[PDB]
Swiss-Prot record, chain B:
Disulfide bonds: none annotated. The chain holds residues 210 to 259 of 458 of the full protein. It comes from Escherichia phage T5 (Enterobacteria phage T5). It is found in: Virion. Major capsid protein that self-associates to form 120 hexamers and 11 pentamers, building the T=13 icosahedral capsid which about 860 Angstroms in diameter. Responsible for its self-assembly into a procapsid. The phage does not need to encode a separate scaffolfing protein because its capsid protein contains the delta domain that carries that function. The capsid gains its final stability through the reorganization of the subunits that takes place upon expansion. DNA encapsidation through the portal triggers capsid expansion and the binding of the decoration protein to the capsid exterior. This is Major capsid protein. Interacts with the decoration protein; each hexon binds a single copy of the decoration protein. Interacts with the portal protein.
Length: 50, 50
């Protein structure tokens, strides 16, 4: 509500409250496989070796 | 010895004007304690013949 109680007479409509422009989140996950093993760079579609 | 303090209520917020319904802020009762004191005593005597 915002119409209750009138202090003392004059009151305003809904949506008169300032808020905070930013975005946040409580958690993410755990992540580890993307920074463990080495990368092997390869130009071609496939590679062979003996 | 003062009383304990204190259980205070929360204002429901649909009214205004003081108008505030605070349960009465009762000042309890100031109290004391009587420190009673007793007497202890003893006697003894002797004789010339002992």
């Amino acid at each position: 509500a915002v119409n209750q109680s009138s202090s003392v007479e004059v009151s305003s409509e809904s949506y008169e409250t300032i808020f905070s422009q930013r975005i946040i989140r409580d958690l993410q996950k755990e992540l580890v496989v993307g920074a463990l093993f080495e990368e092997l760079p390869m130009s071609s579609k496939i590679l062979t070796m003996l | 010895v003062e009383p304990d303090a204190g259980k205070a209520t929360w204002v429901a917020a649909s009214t205004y004007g003081t108008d505030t319904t605070t349960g009465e802020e009762v000042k309890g009762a100031l109290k004391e304690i009587h420190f009673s004191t007793y007497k202890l005593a003893a006697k003894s005597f002797i004789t010339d013949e002992t």
